[PDB]
Amino acid sequence: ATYPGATAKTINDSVVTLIERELSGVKNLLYYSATTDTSGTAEITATFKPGTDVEMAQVDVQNKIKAVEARLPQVVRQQGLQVEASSSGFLMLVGINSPNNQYSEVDLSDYLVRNVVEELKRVEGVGKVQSFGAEKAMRIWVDP
Amino acid sequence: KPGTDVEMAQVDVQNKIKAVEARLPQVVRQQGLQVEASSSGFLMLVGINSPNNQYSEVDLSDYLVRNVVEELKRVEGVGKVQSFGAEKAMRIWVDPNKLVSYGLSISDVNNAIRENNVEIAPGRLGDLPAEKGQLITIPLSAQG
Amino acid sequence: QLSSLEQFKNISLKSKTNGSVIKLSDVANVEIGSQAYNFAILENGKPATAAAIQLSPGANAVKTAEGVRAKIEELKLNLPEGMEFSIPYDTAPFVKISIEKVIHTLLEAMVLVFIVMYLFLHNVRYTLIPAIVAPIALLGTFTVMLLAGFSINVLTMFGMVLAIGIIVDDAIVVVENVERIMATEGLSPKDATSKAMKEITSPIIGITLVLAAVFLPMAFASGSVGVIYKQFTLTMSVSILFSALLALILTPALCATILKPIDGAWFDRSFDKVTKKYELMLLKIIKHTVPMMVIFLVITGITFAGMKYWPTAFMPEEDQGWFMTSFQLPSDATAERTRNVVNQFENNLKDNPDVKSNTAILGWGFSGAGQNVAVAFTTLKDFKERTSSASKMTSDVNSSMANSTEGETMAVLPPAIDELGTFSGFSLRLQDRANLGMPALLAAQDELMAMAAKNKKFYMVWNEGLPQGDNISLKIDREKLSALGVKFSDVSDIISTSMGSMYINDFPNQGRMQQVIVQVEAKSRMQLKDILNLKVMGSSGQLVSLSEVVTPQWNKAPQQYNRYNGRPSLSIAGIPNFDTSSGEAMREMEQLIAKLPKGIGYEWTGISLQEKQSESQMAFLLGLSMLVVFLVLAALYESWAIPLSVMLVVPLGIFGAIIAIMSRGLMNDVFFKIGLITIIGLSAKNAILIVEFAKMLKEEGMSLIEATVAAAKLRLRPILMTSLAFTCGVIPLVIATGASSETQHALGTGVFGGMISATILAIFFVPVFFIFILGAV
């Protein structure tokens, strides 16, 4: 759950508690955790019993949060609640470097986001691709 | 049908309403369609009374909503907790006679409250891209 | 829509008070940067980028890696000059080398058991009769794996390695009995095979039923410990069932058609002489009946003591060829400080040790992001060109980082199981169960950290999260605003917009719609004073700075909010100290936590919780398995004394198992539990081999003692044959030294000691048990 800018106290008292109020009583719930950090982001991880069907359990979580998607702040709602059967460690960490220094780090991250991350995600068996580098963007540094 | 998997059937209903969640009025949509595998009768009816009359009914309902309903819902086996009592809230009983007397409309009072009582995004002092030469980063806070 | 800096800089902008139409470049430096500058990447000290690929739920690691490497090779062709692709962190190579090492040890087990059976029969034929049942039983196990929805992992493979020495038991029994009949009576292969069948058909079935029923309850255990038991259960049980089907169906045909007439070095007289000395020693033993039962009571006592006292673990750590290094700098730390810390750590292991590649991610870290958090995935050079081990390296990094750069850098090993935890060790969650508030929980937390600093079984039990930090809350004096005549909404706008970095809309940049972010320039949002230099329009027409209407105040508050099972909590990582198991640390943590303020609870999460379940259900798995074997035995031999005599041999196998574990210095992990049950089964096998024939000879009219000694002597050869077979088949597990060798060490040491015991201590005690239990009734 994203809620940009807002510090962790706001995500903790306005968002996480709401979702956690529905996470209970889910089928085969082994244990559940929720961490809100300073990036204006909360990760609520419901860990189910070992061997439980991850698909149907993911469905159960979707159903429970559906009952709490109308009370979250407007930004949270119109920013989406990405619910995914997740993992902890990275399988591998593909990267792009520039030994001749012909491209600054921003150009490498741009190229990686625009022409690599999509085609990496389009591989069978790749569940998530987290890009540690942001796409290019027209920045307007105003001067107050 | 009796004995049908309530989970997959709930999923089916979710799918069917997904095809009709884009035509409903805007309020309906941005108020959410809470789809839940439901029940008819209450298992039990927890309540809070005040025999010494030290707390009015509004205070009891407030305490019940703020410190009981959440922890009741956080019990395993509790599917829904319907609170027959509303949380406290700052009520502004306007007087349309005086509203007209000064020349204002309730829309105005609505705007005055929206402006004198705003949620100011926190921001972060020294967030990236940092100025070469910074060693401290304090998360700012506003209070409006 | 604008597409170039030129069009953006010339964006008109009406000037509020004067009238001049200014451009955007007058009030703002327009430039192309990145959407958000959250994370950075240091690959081998150089700035670069990266893309962490998280495996799909239940996908294949090796296949996914094959696909991603192929896609990288494909995309290499379209890389402008200057860009180079790299995989500076990859785990599936280790999956490929682990599964290959396990298949290699499986083949080594096959070869060694074939050599043992050849040495005990001396004809390729006689030894080929059983050695054809192992591959067929294994292939049937594979078909059942597929039909049940299983996979080929190191767990089921380890189950097959254990099974190699158990599959061929039945066939060894049949071939030994047929060989023996053709040696003593000289009968033709066909009718000799028929007589051997009419003799040991029920022994074979009994051994089978016992071995397949001892492995059933373990698969019923709950939790990951069960998901681990289920592999070994399915593998070994189906392997034993197919081994029995073959011993009853295929090996009789082989023994009937392709067994050549006995015509045909020193082993023969020495082995027989050995058998005779054993028989005389057995008679001397049976003499002192009560003393040997006293020695058995003593051994059971020692065994129970060891199984109750020896430290417990869950899974052995392994040198996966790489490790992680989490840098947690205090709050108020800037990305420059974390770059300094990471640069120090990167330069600390740059040319001194032998590592393959060290990649650091700035701004990202398991359990929290932020400028003051980095995670560096140093990948060890290799295993064949190594010097210091993963655990010997991490220790070096920890000690060479705790004293130089400010922070919390703690190099840590990869976990045991892939998606259980991020690091090796235990992970506890200190919960706030009585609404004590955050400050109380954090005080309890640092106290617990103070108590864990002087413990010997603890090393660094740090906090896996973000630390408290100073915030700058602004109080707005509304009365001063109304007196100055300034709208409040304008002050709110100015603050929020002055810090926010808001995003507006997109623009077409080289064919792709990229964002257009606006934000107060860097040098105007760094220190607090800059904020207090913002100005708003008053009532009298003159500007009023924010410093006159807002008052800052510095609070101390937690910057990350963690919740567990509903209640606020704090993730407390920890790794046990050298010479201390994970079980001891867990128990020690419980005591420490018991020494904490009231209302503060504690919960185990991940590996710790799974380990707790293992330890809390190891008694019922041994209580239920033993009872199942007893009941099956009583059903098979229609008595209550025979199954007691067969059960009385289990503590001897456990005895050796515990002895081996204590001597080697391993722990009471789940692999040892797997061997514990395997040795129960094999012990029962060695006992039945004697007890059945002794019962038959006693029913044939022979005296109890004479029947007992005759059956022991006649079945010494199959017992030793099968025993040495399984022991030499597991020797590859104990002696393995490559990569992923610690799992094999833990899984083989137990069964090795247990088999050595349940064969050297069985052929002498099972006759004693039989005679005693039958005389006492």
Numbering used by the authors:
A (entry chain C): 47 to 190
B (entry chain A): 95 to 238
C (entry chain C): 239 to 502, 511 to 1023
Question: Mind quoting what the paper says about this structure?
Answer:
Upon antibiotic stress Gram-negative pathogens deploy resistance-nodulation-cell division-type tripartite efflux pumps. These include a H+/drug antiporter module that recognizes structurally diverse substances, including antibiotics. The superfamily of resistance-nodulation-cell division (RND) efflux pumps plays a key role in intrinsic MDR in Gram-negative bacteria. These tripartite complexes comprise an RND transporter in the inner membrane that acts as a secondary active H+/drug antiporter extruding a vast spectrum of structurally unrelated drugs through a periplasmic membrane fusion protein channel connected to an outer membrane channel factor across the outer membrane. A comparison between drug binding of AdeB and Escherichia coli AcrB is made via activity analysis of 20 AdeB variants, selected on basis of side chain interactions with antibiotics observed in the AcrB periplasmic domain X-ray co-structures with fusidic acid (2.3 Å), doxycycline (2.1 Å) and levofloxacin (2.7 Å).
For structural elucidation of this RND transporter, we reconstituted AdeB in Salipro Nanodiscs sustaining a native-like lipid environment. Here, we show the single-particle cryo-EM structure of trimeric AdeB in the OOO conformation and in the L*OO conformation. A C3-symmetric density map could be solved up to a resolution of 3.5 Å. The AdeB trimer adopts mainly a resting state with all protomers in a conformation devoid of transport channels or antibiotic binding sites. All entry sites are closed in the O conformation, and an exit channel is opened. In the O conformation, the PC1 and PC2 subdomains are in close contact constituting a closed cleft. As observed in structures of AcrB, the closure of these entry tunnels appears concomitant with the opening of an exit tunnel in the O conformation of AdeB. Our single-particle cryo-EM results in this work show that 90% of imaged AdeB protomers remain inaccessible to substrates from the periplasm in the O conformation. We assume that the high prevalence of particles in the OOO conformation is not an artifact, as similar trimeric conformations have been observed in another cryo-EM structure of AdeB29 and a crystal structure of Campylobacter jejuni CmeB43. Whereas it is not possible to discern whether the L* conformation is recurring in the postulated AdeB LTO cycle, that state appears to be the only one bearing entrances from the periplasm in the absence of substrates. This would allow initial substrate entry in case drugs enter the periplasm, since the OOO state lacks substrate entry and binding sites.
